[PDB]
Amino acid sequence: VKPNYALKFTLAGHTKAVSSVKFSPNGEWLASSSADKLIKIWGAYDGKFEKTISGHKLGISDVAWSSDSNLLVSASDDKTLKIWDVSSGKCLKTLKGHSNYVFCCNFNPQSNLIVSGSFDESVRIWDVKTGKCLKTLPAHSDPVSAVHFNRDGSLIVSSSYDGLCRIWDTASGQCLKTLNPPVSFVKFSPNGKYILAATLDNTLKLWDYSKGKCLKTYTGHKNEKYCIFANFSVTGGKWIVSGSEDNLVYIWNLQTKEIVQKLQGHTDVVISTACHPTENIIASAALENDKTIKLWKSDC
Numbered sequence: 328v329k330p331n332y333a334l335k336f337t338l339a340g341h342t343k344a345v346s347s348v349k350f351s352p353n354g355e356w357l358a359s360s361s362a363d364k365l366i367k368i369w370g371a372y373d374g375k376f377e378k379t380i381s382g383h384k385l386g387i388s389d390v391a392w393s394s395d396s397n398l399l400v401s402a403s404d405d406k407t408l409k410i411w412d413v414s415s416g417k418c419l420k421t422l423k424g425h426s427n428y429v430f431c432c433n434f435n436p437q438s439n440l441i442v443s444g445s446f447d448e449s450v451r452i453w454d455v456k457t458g459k460c461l462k463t464l465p466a467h468s469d470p471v472s473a474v475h476f477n478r479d480g481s482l483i484v485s486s487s488y489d490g491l492c493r494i495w496d497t498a499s500g501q502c503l504k505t506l507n508p509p510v511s512f513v514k515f516s517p518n519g520k521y522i523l524a525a526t527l528d529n530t531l532k533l534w535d536y537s538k539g540k541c542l543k544t545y546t547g548h549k550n551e552k553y554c555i556f557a558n559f560s561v562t563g564g565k566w567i568v569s570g571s572e573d574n575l576v577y578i579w580n581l582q583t584k585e586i587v588q589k590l591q592g593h594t595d596v597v598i599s600t601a602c603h604p605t606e607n608i609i610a611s612a613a614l615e616n617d618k619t620i621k622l623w624k625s626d627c
């Protein structure tokens with residue numbers, strides 16, 4: 328019916344806005360990125376600080392885990408992405424080619440490719456082993472806000488401030504489909520059939536991408552400025568989860584679109600949220616008046 332998320336830990340350490348939080352696929356870790364140029368690794372269940380990973384020359388907008396939880400990829404204002412060995416903290420590769428800030432990144436399920444989006448309006452596809460750029464897609468006419476592979480890796484979805492969401496064939500780089508307020512976030516649904524898209528008019532929408540039809544709309548939060556992540560919560564009740572510019576985490580019922588919970592505690596915009604892969608745990612993180620990450624746990 329409704330979850331009962333409750334604050335369990337607050338994680339301090341970043342010295343500027345947090346930009347992204349992500350749980351490792353094996354559930355053990357939370358990774359956070361920040362405008363302070365750092366990645367921090369934390370225990371997913373107790374919030375225990377594990378390590379700082381450093382090397383970018385400017386702030387980081389996004390981080391993403393490989394499928395085996397051993398690698399991380401980061402997107403930076405220094406125009407590069409970096410591939411990191413999480414166990415050693417070492418930079419394995421620096422991915423060079425974007426001509427402006429890199430805003431978003433993800434591995435494919437195989438974790439042999441990375442996709443990135445940039446203020447330079449392109450999407451790039453990179454080889455993980457060599458660190459070389461394989462394709463540059465002239466994807467958008469304004470900064471690219473999000474990029475994500477689907478569940479078999481054959482598709483990429485991208486979104487942009489130009490108002491478009493596009494689906495790309497990974498193998499060829501060619502556009503399969505296009506779907507205008509700025510689109511600030513997109514990702515494929517767990518079952519691969521839907522795309523969840525945020526627009527800077529305080530709206531989330533669930534699209535059937537095959538049919539090109541909007542199936543659900545979620546509102547009541549505040550999102551007119553920032554690229555705020557949204558999530559599917561797959562461990563307990565079927566929820567949509569998002570931060571908000573009124574400093575709250577919002578949780579909706581996937582099917583009824585009703586708000587089922589709002590989490591209070593942050594003291595700045597909640598720019599990022601993540602849902603744990605096996606436990607009913609949310610991580611949230613806020614902009615520079617707050618700079619903390621919060622871990623929330625529910626019984627359902």
Ligand SMILES: Cc1nc(NS(=O)(=O)c2cc(Br)cc(Cl)c2O)cn1C1CCCC1
Pocket residue numbers: 516517518519520521533542543559560561564565566567581582
């Ligand atoms: C009931 C249902 N399941 C899906 N699949 S899903 O979006 O991928 C998905 C979301 C979540 Br939260 C958790 C899990 Cl486990 C999932 O599989 C869609 N819908 C309804 C049908 C019409 C659109 C909403």
